[PDB]
């Protein structure tokens, strides 16, 4: 990780130069932090710095809660990221929320969280074909399944009463991705429980796994039908979003992966 510390130290000496440049003009505390806020170049390095810190934070998170990558999911981590990071900016370039140092984080934490829900599900599909998993693997991923589940949910609860007690604003979209992150933990909720009975039984279960996939296919359809009832609210008010059609498009794909799969089994 010598190159990783190289990127951090060079960037720290870059943010160390900007906060020294701003200090030399305005010698006092409060005008320094004000001048770093308003001037477009000093804000971009801090934008660049914070992306580096979360990059190291994600890898440290990926180190602790994931022992070793199977070298077949990082591209699956990559494409769903630039789906989500394009999703957030498109909503931001629609809603006229403007560049402010209070909501640019919230889209990036939205980009942060959504990746690990993808990293949850790829780890549980590998669990479906894992014949040697210890109790330390099983008992520690359920904590990650639970802990970021509630922290997303309580921040959704922080948001949905902010939108209710103020009016229709940019916080309306925020809880809606939080809502499908809310289903995202309820996705790995059912998948752990159905995994729990497969490991303890030394025999395949035919209708049990079929009903397990049938239940997960059901709520995964209901979760998207609330989310389509989310988006369709926004034609009458504000403006045509021209975004969130990409996971509109996969949403009904998951439904057709559910309705036709149930019809063939029935």
């Amino acid at each position: 990780m010598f190159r990783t510390a190289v990127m951090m130290a060079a960037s720290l000496a870059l943010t160390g130069a900007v906060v020294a440049h701003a200090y030399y003009l305005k010698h006092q505390f409060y005008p320094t932090v004000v001048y770093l806020t308003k001037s477009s170049p000093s804000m971009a390095v801090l934008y660049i710095q914070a992306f580096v810190l979360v990059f190291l934070l994600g890898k440290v998170m990926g180190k602790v809660f994931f022992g070793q990558l199977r070298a077949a999911e990082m591209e699956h981590l990559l494409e769903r990221s630039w789906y989500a990071v394009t999703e957030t900016c498109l909503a931001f370039t629609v809603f006229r929320d403007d560049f402010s140092p209070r909501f640019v984080a919230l889209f990036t934490l939205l980009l942060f969280l959504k990746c690990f829900h993808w990293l949850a599900e790829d780890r549980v599909d590998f669990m479906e074909r894992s014949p040697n998993i210890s109790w330390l693997f099983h008992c520690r991923i359920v904590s990650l399944m639970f802990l970021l589940g509630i922290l997303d949910f309580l921040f959704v609860s922080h948001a949905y009463h902010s939108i209710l007690t103020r009016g229709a604003s940019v916080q309306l979209v925020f809880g809606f991705e939080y809502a499908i992150l809310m289903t995202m933990v309820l996705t790995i909720f059912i998948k752990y429980v159905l995994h729990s009975v497969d490991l303890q039984s030394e025999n395949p279960w035919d209708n049990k796994a079929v009903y397990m996939l049938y239940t997960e296919l059901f709520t995964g359809f209901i979760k998207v039908l609330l989310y389509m009832a989310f988006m369709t609210i926004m034609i009458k008010v504000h403006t045509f979003p021209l975004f969130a059609i990409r996971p509109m498009y996969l949403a009904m794909r998951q439904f057709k992966k559910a309705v036709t799969d149930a019809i063939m089994s029935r």
């Binding site: 006092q28 505390f29 409060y30 932090v33 004000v34 806020t37 140092p101 209070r102």
Partner: protein, 438 residues
Amino acid sequence: AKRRQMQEAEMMYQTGMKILNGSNKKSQKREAYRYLQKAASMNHTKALERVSYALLFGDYLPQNIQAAREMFEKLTEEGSPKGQTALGFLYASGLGVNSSQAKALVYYTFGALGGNLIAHMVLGYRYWAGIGVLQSCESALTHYRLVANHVASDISLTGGSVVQRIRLPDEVLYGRGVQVNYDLALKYFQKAAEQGWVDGQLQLGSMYYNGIGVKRDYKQALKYFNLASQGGHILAFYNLAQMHASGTGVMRSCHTAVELFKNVCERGRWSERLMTAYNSYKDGDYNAAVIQYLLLAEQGYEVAQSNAAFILDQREASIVGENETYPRALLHWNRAASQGYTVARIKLGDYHFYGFGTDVDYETAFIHYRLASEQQHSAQAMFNLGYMHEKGLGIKQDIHLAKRFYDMAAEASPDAQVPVFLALCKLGVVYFLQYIRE
């Protein structure tokens, strides 16, 4: 032969006066002023004062203070009204001459008696804000009315060419319907111009290059509307001050009489030296961008008393000595404080906090930050008040009032959220650590 020397002097001076009025070129101005110098060699008074107000102000000549004073003494012995005024300014600001306020006052009173107008404005403000003399309605009212009458009798004819009050420490009851119709017309013009056929990114390629044809006369329309509106506004201010001063309609009032005669006089025609001093601040000549600001500060501008205190603040003026540069900036900060400027009161508190010029006195800076806070709701005054509250600077230390000051600093502006955030985090961290240690 002496009369022939006088005959040649006016012959020399008239050519320079014609060249100055007929050409705006810097080389033409320098040649006309060299003619004025050769006129002043034979002690021609109109040329004496015309070169005296450029040898000292540094705008059309190489600045040289000592020659300007050496001929100012001759101009006062003869009895000029434009020589006693600037000699009073020299004896007031301590500019190349040892300082004394009494000599400044007597020179200013005789320059007012000579019928000058800068000395009238100076004595009016110095009687208004109680500098050097006793505060009063009457003397400031007289010496401001005698300038307001002249500037209206100048603007009702010539229109009173505009000037914009630019601030160095910032950049570097009549007229509602006209204003609302004017911005409404502006926004309709702007949406119409932005409708167009994409007036920016058109089909383009190598561009049509047909011509915009809209910008210069649009700026001309705005500029002449600005000049017209400021004309009408100070017309209305003159009439309001007359009707508040004579007693018709509303009785005699002193205060809003002088505050309108003051705004009338300030918007006058000697405010082009605001631009002359600012333009002498670019191109890096501070030695003449602080003297054309010191005069406008003695006259009573709050733009000039702040620009000349900002210029004296960063140690750039090389005329006033290094051991007298901060008191001569403290004085103008103090004068620009009482005229209702937010930054002036904060910087006065900073001066009393760091011991600039005066001795270090935290309790005295406390009152200045307090007055910057409660009067004008300036965020940085709340924040610095919280900082003094936080570690007991000048008063007893307390956490909860410091927190109160930080939250209303946060509410006071949409700009101050970040530093009050990292202040409240550091305050809670120190409090938690101290409680842990207990």
